[PDB]
Ligand binder design. Structure first.
Ligand SMILES: Nc1ncnc2c1ncn2[C@@H]1O[C@H](COP(=O)(O)OP(=O)(O)OP(O)(O)=S)[C@@H](O)[C@H]1O
Ligand SMILES: [Mg+2]
Lengths: 116, 135
């Protein structure tokens, strides 16, 4: 019915916050190589990424990392609606927390090594 | 002949080992007048009377096997030390790395070449709990 409905393909670009589309689909949706789109998934949860281009991509599919794929409650072969979001808002305060099963050997500083 | 032409600095709290007469024997310095340590002179007198006492519960024996009893296989003993000494002496420091250790080593050779000796010596000289399984 709608040309924004897509199916999940594998990841090639090894960046976390990067999704990929093909050339005629991006020319049909009129995007650019520095835009910011939004992906709707299952369990009423969404994900924001950065859309880029790819020539090896197929017609009605989207390429994304396993991080974005698990943040949407989506597996390989599901359906995702994409929409544009020009609401470019700069952040002010970011409060994050580590997870205990992945920090059980490290202690002290984490800002300078991992996040900086 | 032990203290003669030796000038050995002894101290209260030392156990020394004397070999000879087809026997190794351990003596403990119990009492000295220049406490704690003193160099043995020809002026000294040694009162070797008294009854033999037992061992303190934490004092390990020099009858048991260390690296000194093994000869002729310096390279293989160095290779086993490079494999095993770092996951034993630093357990938790190695736990936080992300490197898997070895988990099984197979010693082989002709009968009589001292394999049980090497296993027991690498056991005792690292403080690891050593369990023995006999076939
Ligand atoms: N490299 C060695 N250095 C010093 N003593 C050794 C050495 N190899 C053997 N011996 C002596 O010979 C004894 C025999 O050693 P073992 O550990 O019984 O050899 P082995 O490999 O266990 O033989 P098998 O196959 O188990 S019967 C040791 O207890 C030592 O007294
Ligand atoms: Mg044996």
């Amino acid at each position: 019915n709608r040309p924004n409905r897509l199916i999940v393909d594998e990841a090639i670009n090894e960046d976390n916050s990067v999704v990929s589309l093909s050339q005629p689909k991006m020319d049909e949706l009129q995007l650019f190589r520095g835009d910011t789109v939004l992906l709707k998934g299952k369990k009423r949860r969404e994900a924001v990424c950065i859309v880029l281009s790819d020539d090896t991509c197929s017609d009605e599919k989207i390429r994304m990392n396993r991080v974005v794929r698990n943040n949407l409650r989506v597996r390989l072969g599901d359906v995702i609606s994409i929409q544009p979001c020009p609401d470019v808002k700069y952040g002010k305060r970011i409060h994050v927390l580590p997870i205990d099963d992945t920090v059980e050997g490290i202690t002290g500083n984490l800002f300078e090594v991992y996040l900086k | 002949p032990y203290f003669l032409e030796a000038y050995r600095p002894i101290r209260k709290g030392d156990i020394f080992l004397v070999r000879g007469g087809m026997r190794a024997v351990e003596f403990k310095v119990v009492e000295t007048d220049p406490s704690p340590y003193c160099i043995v002179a020809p002026d000294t007198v040694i009162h070797c009377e008294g009854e033999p006492i037992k061992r303190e519960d934490e004092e390990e024996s020099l009858n048991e096997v260390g690296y000194d009893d093994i000869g002729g296989c310096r390279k293989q003993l160095a290779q086993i030390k490079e494999m095993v000494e770092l996951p034993l002496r630093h357990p938790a420091l190695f736990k936080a790395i992300g490197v898997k250790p070895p988990r099984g080593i197979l010693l082989y050779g002709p009968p009589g070449t001292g394999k049980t000796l090497i296993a027991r010596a690498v056991a005792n000289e690292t403080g690891a709990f050593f369990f023995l399984i006999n076939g």
